[PDB]
Amino acid sequence: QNQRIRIRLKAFDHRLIDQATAEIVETAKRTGAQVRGPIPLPTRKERFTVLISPHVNDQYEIRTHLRLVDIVEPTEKTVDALMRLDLAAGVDVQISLG
Amino acid sequence: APKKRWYVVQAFSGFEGRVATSLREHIKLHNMEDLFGEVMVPTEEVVEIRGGQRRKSERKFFPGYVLVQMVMNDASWHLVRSVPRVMGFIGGTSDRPAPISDKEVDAIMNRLQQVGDKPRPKTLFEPGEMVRVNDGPFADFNGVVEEVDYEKSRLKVSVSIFGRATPVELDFSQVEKA
Amino acid sequence: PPDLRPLVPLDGGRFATSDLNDLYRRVINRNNRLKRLLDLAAPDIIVRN
Amino acid sequence: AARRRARECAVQALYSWQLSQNDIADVEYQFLAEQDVKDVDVLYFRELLAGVATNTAYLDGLMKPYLSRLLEELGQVEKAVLRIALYELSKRSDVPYKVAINEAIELAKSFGAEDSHKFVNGVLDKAAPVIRPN
Amino acid sequence: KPERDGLFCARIFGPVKDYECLCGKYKRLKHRGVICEKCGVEVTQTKVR
Amino acid sequence: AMHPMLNIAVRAARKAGNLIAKNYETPDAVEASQKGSNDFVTNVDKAAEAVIIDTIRKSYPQHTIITEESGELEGTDQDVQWVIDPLDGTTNFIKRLPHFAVSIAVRIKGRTEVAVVYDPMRNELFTATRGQGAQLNGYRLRGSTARDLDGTILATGFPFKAKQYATTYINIVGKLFNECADFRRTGSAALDLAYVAAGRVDGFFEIGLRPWDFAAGELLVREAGGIVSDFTGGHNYMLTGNIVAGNPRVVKAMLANMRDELSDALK
Ligand SMILES: [Mg+2]
Ligand SMILES: [Zn+2]
């Protein structure tokens, strides 16, 4: 079927990014899906600020990592295991299909 | 220096095209091109590649009527009323029609520039409606469009993958109802 | 209500289209058309007629 | 820009390689398919693909007793970056200690985990013996 | 089937069959009173039409 | 299917209600911050408001929003308005009384188009959209079946912020109590209107209501078979904050009953 099942993955954590990426590419290479590279684009600075009850009148810039992995073989069991096998929170999982 | 204004005449349900044809033909008949400037039937071309109607679709600004650049005179009046299938002169009192205003012409022509410039697929989408997916990767799943795009045209749509809802960039070509 | 103006079929796809349904079709068609014109820049004489 | 930084132009490949575990030729294939990179001399692209030869283990075997921590715990990004930086001087012999290590420290800042450079530099003091005629 | 937003729309008037949702999500007298969510029609006796 | 704007609004309302409920179990953090004459605006109201506005901006960065706190935040497409009360009956919340709701309504070209109110405590979600009706967690809402004043239950709010009319109001109250069955005083005009839509009260009336409170209920009762009006049958209510609503016959009886007692200030 269609090719560009391309998942970008932003986060501020690292090791769970590795866990999720490894699990995802596992599902890919196990379900017959021809996985492309994770290809982690350069880690980016991302601005925070303390938007809580502040100090009376604390990360503010973080290295958000980006894993831009691509899967080009959507079998049935691919989408099956994908929607089945879950991912940790704290990750931006804006994906693209095309 | 007789300036031919712009008038409107009622056509019928499904006759407008041949009405405009016959009008130009009768103009040529009486050779009265000087009295009849141009017969305008504005239309629209909404383009969708699938979903029944495919690769194009033809809408009109408003049916039942035809726009002319006639000049007012009883001769021209009967020349338009001596045609196969029309109603009277849409306007004020009959036998004394009301030419449409110039601002009307200008606005309608801006409309025509807009429509003919960009082929704009109508039956558009609204952020917040739910819709399924008829595409291989997400066959018969259903999520909600969180953002609609036109140039990119890739339907930012939140759907349920691996528990957590997430956006997806599937194109118009695979959307379900609405 | 839909009951009091029923659309009873025939042996085939032939339905007894009660006049009420047809008049309602006509008027609702005019209404939809007129509204669609109202949002679409409304040429004055046309919306009048 | 082109010659040296070439490394960090395709460490991705390495990463993806060390994650994909497929044919390195197809790895570079999909990588060059991903984008047209011009900050890399294609000879260094061939070097990076040559960076598969088994001495990879050996170069981490180079520091295998010279390790502050375990190997798998070193992230795949650090794994790949350090492995290719040592593939420069453990099997390829491209440049001396200072040059290649300035490379390995400067061209992992857009990939490290906010502290990677301190540990890679503290453990890479093994790069001094590997080219002792520094 | 009665067309949605039409002169016989079950959603706007009522279920065509007694205590039976239009989309077939309910066919039991118990579930009387809950609108559906696939066609969105109340489940009552057809008399309400 | 479903109405889109309705859907995004109900998502916003769900998030807001969950936030309010989560904060409801720590009364040591939410303080009493008064604004006018006994109209508290706690920080939790601000947080819920911000959450709702954020959730909306995702799907309509161009729609002008209205809020009792932030006044009127203009949008690049101001033909459609979003009226919000992140909390109704702030007093009922500060006393930790578990009866309140968040209200979100969307007007198009001035005419109200969709409305939702959400009570997190009882977990009730009154939705309403014009041309489709009103629903309570999946049940249609045809209001009270009352057709007189006997046996009728009248929900109401008191002008405890416009106390000058108190006597007047109380006056009419007495008159009403001579014909109705019993009163109800809950403290949240949105929820009272909702109850009118659910027939749980045979009618409702109030004086001195902000335009951003009934906007989520007036459409509710309208698509709930009921009707609203000013104290005289007109439509100046949207400016007078004087509402009377209920099923039509009861509204007629109430208006004919109240027209005499009414102080000509409200007329
Ligand atoms: Mg409020
Ligand atoms: Zn159904």
Side-chain angles (χ1 to χ4, degrees), chain C residues 6-18 25:
Chain C
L7 186 48
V8 56
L10 268 62
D11 62 292
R14 197 49 95 198
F15 290 70
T17 318
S18 57
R25 286 218 291 102

Side-chain angles (χ1 to χ4, degrees), chain E residues 21-26 36-41:
Chain E
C21 171
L22 167 62
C23 80
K25 210 199 158 207
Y26 308 93
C36 171
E37 319 85 316
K38 302 329 158 204
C39 46
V41 60

Side-chain angles (χ1 to χ4, degrees), chain F residues 117-151:
Chain F
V117 304
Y118 187 98
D119 164 28
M121 297 327 289
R122 307 170 183 278
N123 191 28
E124 319 202 81
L125 168 69
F126 303 74
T127 175
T129 179
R130 204 174 43 78
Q132 292 192 17
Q135 322 159 2
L136 192 159
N137 316 327
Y139 302 164
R140 278 213 67 107
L141 315 174
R142 295 317 281 181
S144 303
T145 185
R147 42 189 285 173
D148 61 71
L149 278 191
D150 165 40

Side-chain angles (χ1 to χ4, degrees), chain D residues 13-95:
Chain D
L14 316 180
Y15 184 102
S16 42
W17 166 53
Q18 295 183 353
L19 194 46
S20 41
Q21 307 304 338
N22 278 9
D23 291 323
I24 185 53
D26 285 343
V27 168
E28 312 279 5
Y29 187 75
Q30 309 165 22
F31 180 90
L32 60 90
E34 184 68 28
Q35 82 277 46
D36 43 3
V37 55
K38 276 78 72 185
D39 299 332
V40 55
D41 203 77
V42 179
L43 181 134
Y44 279 139
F45 213 77
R46 307 270 97 87
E47 177 277 338
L48 303 154
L49 71 85
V52 69
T54 190
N55 279 316
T56 64
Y58 187 36
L59 51 82
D60 282 330
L62 216 74
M63 283 83 62
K64 191 169 71 173
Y66 197 95
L67 286 170
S68 316
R69 321 281 170 81
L70 271 56
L71 285 173
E72 68 263 15
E73 61 88 28
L74 296 168
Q76 305 296 349
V77 51
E78 326 299 330
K79 185 72 61 197
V81 164
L82 184 78
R83 272 188 180 194
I84 212 60
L86 274 301
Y87 188 82
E88 311 156 352
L89 277 78
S90 73
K91 199 182 164 286
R92 191 75 167 75
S93 88
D94 212 359
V95 280

Side-chain angles (χ1 to χ4, degrees), chain F residues 93-109:
Chain F
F93 178 76
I94 278 188
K95 291 300 169 171
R96 218 174 76 177
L97 197 146
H99 178 293
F100 40 87
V102 55
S103 87
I104 295 91
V106 181
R107 293 174 178 168
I108 289 189
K109 310 308 193 304

Side-chain angles (χ1 to χ4, degrees), chain F residues 45 68 85-90 212-213:
Chain F
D45 198 305
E68 53 183 59
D85 182 349
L87 166 60
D88 210 44
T90 80
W212 46 67
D213 292 330

